[PDB]
Design a protein around this ligand. Sequence first.
Ligand SMILES: COc1ncccc1NS(=O)(=O)N1CCC[C@H](C(N)=O)C1
Ligand SMILES: [Zn+2]
Length: 139
Amino acid sequence: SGAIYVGNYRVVNRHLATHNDWANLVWEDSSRDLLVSSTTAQGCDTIARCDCQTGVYYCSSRRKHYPVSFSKPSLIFVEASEYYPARYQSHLMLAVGHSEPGDCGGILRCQHGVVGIVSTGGNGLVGFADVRDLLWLDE
Ligand SMILES: COc1ncccc1NS(=O)(=O)N1CCC[C@H](C(N)=O)C1
Ligand SMILES: [Zn+2]
C-alpha cells in the first residue's frame, strides 16, 4: 500500500484504488497501473522533473529503504494476475531489489523528489510506475 500526495491530487496503483478514489477520479490508465484522484487537503509530496536512473525506494515487506539503479521508463511484458490480463505495461522502470505484492505503492525518490511507486516485482526484481512525465500534477 501507499500513495503520493501532491497539491490536490492523490496518486495510487490503479489496482489498489478504493471506492472513494473512483468517486473523485481525475485520470486513470490501466496500461500504466496508475490512478489519480482529487483531495480536499494539500499534499505533503513534490515530484522529480529529472532523468535520474538511481534512487531509494521504501520496501514495506522489509520495513527498510534500499538504494537502486533502475532502467528508463519503457513498455514491459507483465504476466496475468488477479487484477489484469497478460499485457504490456508502459512507463515501467525495473531494478534489482526485493518486493512482494503488498509492497505496491512504496515510493521511489531521488535527490529531486518523487520518481514513481512500486507496481511490479518478482525473483529479485522490483518495477516502478514512473510519474515524472505527468507535468499536470504540479498545477
Ligand atoms: C513479487 O510480486 C510482486 N512484487 C511487487 C509488486 C507486484 C508483484 N506481483 S506482480 O508483478 O505479479 N503484479 C501483481 C499486481 C498487479 C501488478 C501490475 N502492475 O500488473 C503486477
Ligand atoms: Zn532526480
